[PDB]
Design a protein around this ligand. Structure first.
Ligand SMILES: CC1=CC(=O)CC(C)(C)[C@@]1(O)/C=C/C(C)=C\C(=O)O
Ligand SMILES: [Mg+2]
Ligand SMILES: [Mg+2]
Lengths: 160, 306
């Protein structure tokens, strides 16, 4: 419904999902703060964003050491507070994820008889020279899984 | 007693995440790890009772933050000293022993215990008990340590920091970098179902450019805290030991580091806490790495072995 992609043959696409024992309004309140991704993203060390959070907003992220890259420039491409959809594209940085675009949706659910959230995040990206589609999807998936794990932990710590 | 110098800088990096340790007389080495009980008893000496002082030097290259490198700086020598004392007491209960296996085991258990303390798997003591993880799951550190005594150097390495010995003014590698594309390391990772991906260097899952570290619990079981251990008896032609993070070794070879360190020590003595000659050698290696374009934190310990 929301995470369809048509990657070409120079691109790859995949998705990850995570169940969170927290209500949708809380998880969305975390992920909607485009100016502060470090609230749940465990690799972000600094983020700078000027102005109001709207389509076209741009944030400058520095990531922590040990990673294949150090910085990323990211543009907000979609923000839907009714259907809870967020879409971001990587427009700059010193990394190898060219024309990366991601879509994240949050959905209500019941988990252990309590209000819960299903988060899905999909992406499309160019496969960088010297790598395969499989490797690129594997790498992005590992990172996105860390991000969604931390988002689950932060949300569930807030509800407790 | 130990003659050493230590130079460290964040360099052109924003924050400093290298840490280092230099602890004289940190422990007594059980002599039963160096010679058999039978041979010493032939001389009337009790191998379980003999005391040999040892000093510990260590370089800990942190990533994701400085907290695990600093924890290693504060804890590895304490855990190792306690483990060595316990091992001496338990060797008093045993016959002949394979010595290299016990060096491997004591260092493996020490590194694993520090890792478990970092990840909150075991409780730690500071007059107070600590239990939750020291920091986040994507924070880690290398650990290259050298136990130095009068007769032997024992090296335990976990990660891509490196220690080199200058012997006969020639380099001898006392540690092999744990790089993910190393054939045995790739085989181990791939046997566990993991991937080694060339993504700005060969990396575990494409993320981390080392196959072993302390911390990094989000990359287990692919990144392990298991050290590789080398026991090297000291020799006539020993000049010095060089421990350093990859901030040095990325831009300086083993050969150049050994030559520079040894000649700096000799030049200081000709021309003229830490030792000034070894400190000048470490400062020169640091500044050299900076001059040759190193981007990273740089930490260098030089131990004069003469
Ligand atoms: C942690 C990470 C490693 C890199 O090499 C690229 C980049 C700097 C973009 C970075 O943020 C990438 C993050 C990714 C893939 C997704 C996200 O966080 O939404
Ligand atoms: Mg570092
Ligand atoms: Mg380094």
């Amino acid at each position: 419904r929301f995470h369809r992609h048509e990657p070409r043959d120079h691109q790859c696409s995949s998705a990850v999902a995570k169940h969170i024992k927290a209500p949708v309004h809380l998880v969305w309140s975390l992920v909607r703060r485009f100016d502060q991704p470090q609230l749940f993203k465990p690799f972000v060390s600094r983020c700078e964003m000027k102005g109001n959070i709207e389509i076209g907003s741009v944030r400058e992220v520095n990531v922590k050491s040990g990673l294949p890259a150090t910085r990323s420039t990211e543009r907000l491409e979609l923000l839907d507070d009714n259907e809870h959809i967020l879409s971001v594209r990587f427009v700059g940085g010193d990394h190898r994820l060219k024309n990366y675009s991601s879509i994240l949706t949050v959905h209500p659910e019941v988990i252990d008889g309590r209000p819960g959230t299903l988060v899905i995040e999909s992406f499309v990206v160019d496969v960088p020279e010297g790598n395969t589609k499989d490797e690129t999807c594997y790498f992005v998936e590992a990172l996105l899984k860390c991000n969604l794990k931390s988002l689950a932990e932060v949300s569930e710590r807030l509800v407790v | 007693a130990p003659v050493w110098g230590c130079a460290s800088t964040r360099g052109r990096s924003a924050e400093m995440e290298d840490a280092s340790a230099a602890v004289p007389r940190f422990a007594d080495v059980p002599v039963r790890l160096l010679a058999s009980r039978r041979d010493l008893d032939a001389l009337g000496l009790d191998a379980d009772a003999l005391r040999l002082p040892a000093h510990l030097f260590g370089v800990f290259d942190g990533h994701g933050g400085a907290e695990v490198a600093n924890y290693c700086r504060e804890r590895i020598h304490v855990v190792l000293s306690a483990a060595l004392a316990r091992l001496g007491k338990n060797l008093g209960e045993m016959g002949e022993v394979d010595m290299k296996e016990h060096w491997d085991d004591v260092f493996t258990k020490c590194f694993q215990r520090v890792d478990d303390e970092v990840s909150g798997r075991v409780t730690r003591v500071v007059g107070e008990v600590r239990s939750e993880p020291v920091t986040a799951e994507n924070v880690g550190s290398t650990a290259v340590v050298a136990l130095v005594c009068s007769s032997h150097v024992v090296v335990a390495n976990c990660g891509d920091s490196r220690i080199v010995l200058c012997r006969g003014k020639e380099p001898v590698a006392l540690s092999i970098d744990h790089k993910p594309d190393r054939k045995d390391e790739r085989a181990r990772i791939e046997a566990q179902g993991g991937k080694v991906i060339q993504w700005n260097g060969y990396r575990v899952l494409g993320v981390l450019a080392m196959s072993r570290s302390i911390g990094d619990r989000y990359l287990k079981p692919f990144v392990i805290p298991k050290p590789e251990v080398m026991v090297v008896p000291r020799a006539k032609d020993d000049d010095c030991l060089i421990l350093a993070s990859d901030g040095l070794w990325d831009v300086v070879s083993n050969e150049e580091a050994c030559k520079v360190a040894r000649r700096q020590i000799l030049l200081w003595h000709k021309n003229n806490s830490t030792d000034p000659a070894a400190q000048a050698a470490a400062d020169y290696l640091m500044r050299l790495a900076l001059k040759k374009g190193s981007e990273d934190n740089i930490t260098v310990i030089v131990v004069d072995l003469k």
